Structures are given as C-alpha cells and as structure tokens.
Amino acid sequence: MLGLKTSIIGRRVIYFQEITSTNEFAKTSYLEEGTVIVADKQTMGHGRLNRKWESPEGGLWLSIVLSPKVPQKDLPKIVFLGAVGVVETLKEFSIDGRIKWPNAVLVNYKKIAGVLVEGKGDKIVLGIGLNVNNKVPNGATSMKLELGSEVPLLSVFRSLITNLDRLYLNFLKNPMDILNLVRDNMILGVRVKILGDGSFEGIAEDIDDFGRLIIRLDSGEVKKVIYGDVSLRFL
Amino acid sequence: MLGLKTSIIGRRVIYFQEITSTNEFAKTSYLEEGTVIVADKQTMGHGRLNRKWESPEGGLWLSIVLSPKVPQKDLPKIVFLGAVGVVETLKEFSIDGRIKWPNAVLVNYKKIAGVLVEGKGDKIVLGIGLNVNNKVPNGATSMKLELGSEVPLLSVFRSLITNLDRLYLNFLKNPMDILNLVRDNMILGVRVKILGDGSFEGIAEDIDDFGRLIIRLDSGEVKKVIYGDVSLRFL
Ligand SMILES: Nc1ncnc2c1ncn2[C@@H]1O[C@H](COP(=O)(O)OC(=O)CCCC[C@@H]2SC[C@@H]3NC(=O)N[C@@H]32)[C@@H](O)[C@H]1O
Ligand SMILES: Nc1ncnc2c1ncn2[C@@H]1O[C@H](COP(=O)(O)OC(=O)CCCC[C@@H]2SC[C@@H]3NC(=O)N[C@@H]32)[C@@H](O)[C@H]1O
16 A cells, blocks of 8 residues: 555565564564565664664664675675665755765764664665654754654655665666765765774775775874774764 | 554554465465555455455555454454444545445445455454555446545555554454444345345345344245355345
8 A cells, every 4th residue: 555666675565563673573584575674663773783773653763675696795885775875865855964984874963874784694684773753862863853843754764765776776787886876975084083992093085895994094004994883073 | 654553453564565465465474463464456356255356556455364362153243344444434534335244345336345354263364455546347436436536545544454453452342342333334224135046035124143134035034144155236
C-alpha cells in the first residue's frame, strides 16, 4: 500500500512499532537484497563500538540489506552512500547537512544523523539513524529543530529511500562516483583530532580512492585514516 | 516510521511492492501474531476454492497472522472480523458497505471487498482484499468508483488496521460480540439461493449464535447454513 517506486531498496519493507536494533535484526534474519528494516523506536540502538544510539519515537531508524557484487575494496564506500543519501534528503527539506568523516551528517556542526555499516557473511547491512521529530541528546539536532515544525516522518522515509536506491544502482555500475559526491559534501580544509591510541591532529585534506581520510600533520607527514573518531571542535 | 499505535494487529508490517499472495506468504512464513502482510499487487491472489482474485496496484491487499486463544467453536467467526472491519472503514470514508454472508462486502450490491480465512491449527491467517483505486472486474466496484476520485491508500490501511485491532481485542474477550456487529451490517430480509445439487431458496432472515445463515423456505421450513464451499446468490 506504500506504492514505492524504487528498483531495489524498498522492494520490501519490514516495519516494527518497537525493536532492539534494526541492524541486529537485519544481520540475523534471512532477507532478500533491498529489504528495509524500519522501526518507530529502538531499545538497543547502537553506533560504532559499544556506543548507544538514542532512538526514541519521532526519528527515522532503519537498515537496508545489500549484496554488492563488486570488488572487496569498494565495500568501505557503502557508509558514504548512506551519508550522501541523507544529505540529499535534507536538501530537499531545505536543510544543509555536511558530512563528517566517516559516517556522520552535521548541520551547523550539530549531529543530525549517523550511519553504521556491518557485513555479516556476504550480506551487507546499511544502518541509518536520522533525527526528525524526536528528542535528541545535547549537542545534537533534528529536522524539526532546524525547520521549527513537525516534519512528516513518512515523507522523509520516501525521500531517503528514493535517493538511496538511485545512489546504490549507480554505485553498482560506477563505484567511484560516490567519492566525489562525498568530497563536495564533506567538511574539509580544517584542523581535526583523530582519537584513540596514537591520537594526533592535522588538516583534513580529502579522502582518497579507498575513502581513507587524508590528514596532513604539522610536520608535513601524511597519514591515511581507515577508521576512528574525528573531532572538529575539540577546544 | 508508520507510528502505528495498535496493540496487536500491526505490531509488525511487512510491505511488498509485489507478491504472489499475502495469504500464502502469511500462512507459509514464520511470523508473530499481529503481523500484517501487505502488497501493492498480487500475481496470484485468490479467493475460496483457489478462485482468482484480481489484485492490481491501487487496491488494499493484506493478510493478518492471528493465534486467537478462544474455543475451537469460535474460530469460524474470524472471517466476520474482517468483514466488519472493512464495513467500518468504508463508513469512515462515507461509503455504505453491506455484508454478504459470510465473507464479502457490497456497495449497492457490487462487490468492493472479499475476506478469506485460512488456518491450520493454532495459526490463523485473515486475508482481506479491498478495491480502492484499482480497476475492478465485472460485478465489482471500488472506493474510487464510489467516491469519484483517487483515495489515499495509506489512509485506508491505517483506518482498517485500527478497526481490526479493536475488533480482534474484543473478540478475544467476548467471541460472541462480533455476531451482533455482523447482523447490523449484513444484507437480510431478501431472497437468496443455494446453488447446485440439492439447491433451495428462501429469505435470509438472520445469523444464529454460531454465525449460521438462517433461511426460511417458502414452505416455512427453516435451514441453517454453515459456510464452506457453498455458493449463495441473491435473487
Ligand atoms: N539520536 C542521536 N542523534 C545524534 N547523536 C546521537 C544520537 N544518539 C546517540 N548519539 C551520539 O552519537 C554517538 C554514536 O556515534 P557513532 O559515530 O559511533 O555511530 C553512529 O553515528 C551510527 C549510528 C547508526 C544508527 C542506526 S539507527 C538504524 C540502525 N540500527 C542500529 O542499531 N544502528 C543503526 C554516540 O556515542 C552519542 O554520543
Ligand atoms: N478485485 C476484485 N474485486 C471484487 N470481486 C473480485 C475481484 N477479483 C475477483 N473477484 C470475484 O470474486 C470471486 C472470489 O470470491 P470469493 O467469495 O470466493 O473470495 C473472496 O471474496 C476472497 C478474497 C480474498 C482476497 C484477499 S487479497 C489479500 C489475501 N491474499 C490472497 O491471495 N487472498 C486474500 C471471484 O470468483 C471473482 O468472480
């Protein structure tokens, strides 16, 4: 009854009033490619590592099952499809989101969305969390806060799914295309701090062909980040 | 993202752009009670005796998985929950649907919806096909044809699900209450005929405490019909 017009992403949608985690459900259940798992609320939503992702009613919490028959080296770009998709959807609602490497979307430096990609077996799970009308943690933001009014959650869903389907189908054909859309919508040319053991700072110059964040340290040394947390305003 | 607020029916919803049959999928798959299976269109929709049920995109084609904890005697009444639910939803849209015992809803005697219940043991599948914006076969009608304009399919879905959840919840507590709702909404006081070998005709007077159709033959004889493979028609 939704009448979705997408080719793959959205072929099937499994909606839950409540769930532990759409990503977890997607990983442990046999689902065909393109199936979307979405829930009004998540009780065990999660980000990277052991981080909880607040998922109260009002937001858009979903996961998409993908089976990318592309080289293994390109698989790390799936996160970007999710981030760009969000950026495009926000633009449709007159919101300017900017990507924060490697999986976040910010509006005036406030996190409005996060992406989490996991690969159980040869099946890839693209998880996306976007704040729409829900309450958010301090420092974060939502579409409702940015627009000052309730936004039809289903409208955001249709919009995001439409963008993701187009981005995914193109990615399967022209896998390097997503990098340039990321570069044009990512926060660059600024000093950032890369946390974790062996923490360092430098200018986030760009992302390379593997999607690695290229950092120029003050010494001139160039480092390529594959994973980790980026901090824009750390002081 | 649908924000359904029902207690049982609609706790989960699996949406299909296309499916063979929501009833077949619902009967075959391992699904929790209350799960709704809905599709834009069915390639193999069916009614009783595997009769073809036209299911083009534009109509409401769905099945609900149920595991009613009530006496075996009451199970045959589940079909009535579907019929009454449809009638109530049509009334909300100002369409006067009337029940044709025991599984169809008519508007000015044209079929606008059909109900099909299938169940093996504890698992019961309640299937409902309702013509909304789709083209229909001869002898049928649709919400769009009755109202004169495209009808929001999602609104019809939300309405039907809300009604079905309430009716089902009450059925679990008082399995007999559904019979009164059927009586007040079914076509009675007119002549009908039971076709085939041993055929007979008479006035459809009412339904008894077992949901049987009470027919008074011209001779005054009273017959109680139990729905099965019997084909009944209005004269
Ligand atoms: N609702 C929210 N909005 C903005 N920031 C939040 C937030 N909830 C938590 N945070 C913060 O963001 C951090 C998490 O950041 P990370 O970069 O590691 O992790 C992420 O940014 C990924 C989040 C992925 C969420 C989706 S929801 C659908 C699917 N099902 C799941 O279980 N997960 C995915 C936390 O440590 C918090 O400080
Ligand atoms: N779209 C339509 N609208 C009105 N009448 C139709 C129709 N398509 C076929 N018919 C006629 O209705 C008769 C079927 O009547 P019956 O009384 O036996 O059977 C019914 O009235 C039950 C129909 C149940 C349909 C739903 S759709 C969701 C679920 N998935 C399925 O595969 N089935 C269920 C056919 O023999 C046709 O003459």
